[PDB]
Amino acid sequence: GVSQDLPAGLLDDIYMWATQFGDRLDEIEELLTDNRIWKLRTVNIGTVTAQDALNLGLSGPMLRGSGIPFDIRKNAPYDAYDKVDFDVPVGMNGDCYDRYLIRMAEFRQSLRIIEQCCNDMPAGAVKVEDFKINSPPRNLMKEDMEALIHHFLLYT
Amino acid sequence: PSVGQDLPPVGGYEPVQWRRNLPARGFRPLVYLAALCGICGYGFYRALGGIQERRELKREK
């Protein structure tokens, strides 16, 4: 699972960060996306066709640079990506420019995850439930005999 | 039980901005071209006027 619980006031802080990161990113987007020097330097550079993007074993932003709709957190989902709604950017020409554009959009989609995950955060345990694969808390192992045994054995 | 953790608000946070905020700014391009031609033509007016004066001054000297 997770090492330990969040600190006391961080959920209120990632929100305050995200509210301004939304515009701090558009600002970086403006001097590159329609820069004609940045365009001319990467438009037909690094073109990979969709059929040999599979033969080379390429994935992520290089496979989705070439037009193929495949990413793991939608196709074979894990770790509460089912519960979080987002979309996926996929380029069309296999070049460095669409590999740039899909990153500039994955920024936006990650920010969408962050605000949906700050809104939908539940209570409960943060580690797995049993003390035979990760340690008891130090409140417990200093008074519980079973928990001291488990703490001593999970570390040796 | 759960006591003392970081939890979200009772109604949640209000939505942040994740769309592209790239509004098209500026005049139409033909406005900029018309202003460019107007500035350049007025400069040519003053420049060619000054050359003709300088020629008349040369006649005097």
Partner: peptide, 24 residues
């Protein structure tokens, strides 16, 4: 319409459960 008059979010009614229910 100001950054003086923006609300704080630390002063808020937060979520609170009596008890968590997770089925095994």
């Amino acid at each position: 319409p100001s950054w003086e008059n923006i609300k704080d979010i630390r002063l808020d009614p937060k979520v609170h459960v009596d008890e968590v229910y997770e089925p095994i």
